[PDB]
């Protein structure tokens with residue numbers, strides 16, 4: 001079999017892999033990115049397509065333009081289950097044509113020196129003497145099986161986790177997730193019969209009956225075009241998401257023309273803290289494969305880009321030291337936990353609480369202003385729920401005359417702070433990963449028990 005020598009092999013070309021490729025480009029490295037999809041479909045996984053402008057501003061990722069930017073977003077309207085209370089949170093973002101933008105990032109990375117093979121699947125790892133050393137690839141364009149050696153593999157395969165899952169199970173880089181730590185989500189893009197009101201605002205509808213463990217959304221892509229969908233928690237035995245969608249669509253999108261559909265589809269999305277380590281010998285894991293998604297709102301394209309940024313940084317350092325061991329690549333973890341992962345861990349706790357609340361709880365808490373809109377934003381963006389804000393919340397609901405999980409909010413805030421602190425003390429070397437992981441697991445185990 002043909003053998004080729006590369007510095008870096010990136011497996012997957014979605015927002016995570018493409019970000020890694022772009023950030024590593026123009027540096028004189030020999031880089032190959034592969035994706036199983038044909039070029040014109042790369043980036044087309046089902047998504048709401050909404051991403052904060054701040055991510056592009058912080059990471060130096062190409063700004064969306066032309067047909068790539070479908071609609072400018074100025075904020076989100078969050079609806080209570082009874083739709084009687086709407087919270088508005090302001091913030092600039094983009095409703096993107098995801099495949100078009102993703103493909104442009106890849107084409108620019110390619111112009112900047114990255115080699116790209118589409119219709120090419122990494123079939124199995126090359127794993128020797130404890131290191132990932134590359135991959136066996138099947139290129140369906142040229143109909144060739146190829147062995148590619150690399151100093152580092154960037155595993156960016158999305159939820160499939162289709163490369164790292166083939167490594168020896170004792171390695172921390174093969175970590176799986178609980179079925180209840182992901183949602184299944186489904187969306188369609190449709191034209192509307194009536195102009196969309198406040199089309200610069202996304203709509204998110206909380207409802208435990210119509211989207212248990214997730215939410216419904218209505219994300220305008222123009223004055224007369226909308227991405228509408230829902231997510232529901234996995235591992236709970238819920239019926240087909242397609243059936244939830246059909247049953248409740250009219251509640252959230254009475255205005256759509258069901259004869260003018262542009263796209264439809266679903267996929268899984270992780271909703272938890274990141275992989276305990278995103279680095280091991282010869283390999284870094286990013287994006288959905290590394291569980292980079294915000295656990296409370298389900299947004300993962302921004303954090304995918306952050307993970308690509310951190311991967312590129314760690315890889316450049318490893319080429320300086322010549323050390324591609326877990327320790328040599330460990331900055332991946334330090335960078336990612338600082339930039340997003342510690343917040344994710346806090347939000348993993350908060351999500352578990354929110355998923356257990358009843359519609360009556362959410363209606364009451366929103367109507368009574370249990371927390372401010374700005375407090376919700378602080379939780380979403382920093383992962384902080386200050387003990388103070390918790391105290392005010394408890395005073396607000398002190399008149400509630402029935403049993404409610406809402407009264408546990410102070411304890412939830414305490415657990416959030418505790419896990420955030422553990423993440424701010426992320427292990428400085430692989431030798432401490434195990435004991436730290438057990439501490440985190442214990443916090444989660446105890447927290448789960450507190451809600452049962």
Ligand SMILES: Cc1cc2c(cc1C)N(C[C@H](O)[C@H](O)[C@H](O)COP(=O)(O)OP(=O)(O)OC[C@H]1O[C@@H](n3cnc4c(N)ncnc43)[C@H](O)[C@@H]1O)c1[nH]c(=O)[nH]c(=O)c1N2
Nearest residue numbers: 012014015016036047048049050122158185287288300301
């Ligand atoms: C319905 C729905 C709705 C939303 C969202 C998800 C879902 C399912 N999310 C989450 C967001 O879509 C998601 O987190 C990112 O797109 C993940 O990007 P990745 O690059 O990690 O994976 P992604 O899955 O996009 O890419 C993985 C790539 O790897 C390739 N691949 C896999 N195995 C391979 C192999 N062995 N060899 C070669 N190639 C391989 C695949 O072909 C694919 O192109 C979201 N996020 C957000 O920010 N805003 C939102 O509006 C939403 N809404």
Ligand SMILES: CCCCCCCCCCCCCCCCCC(=O)O[C@@H](COC(=O)CCCCCCCCCCCCCCC)COP(=O)(O)OC[C@H](O)CO
Nearest residue numbers: 048050052054183185213214215231297298299302365380
């Ligand atoms: C409930 C858990 C599962 C939910 C997931 C369901 C499935 C989701 C599938 C669809 C996902 C759509 C994703 C939409 C993303 C929005 C755009 C976005 O990126 O978010 C921005 C932020 O917008 C928001 O803050 C959204 C807030 C709404 C969150 C929804 C919470 C619902 C629960 C609240 C109810 C309150 C009830 C009161 C009771 C206490 C900022 O981006 P960022 O958070 O990644 O980071 C920015 C910063 O630079 C950090 O680097």
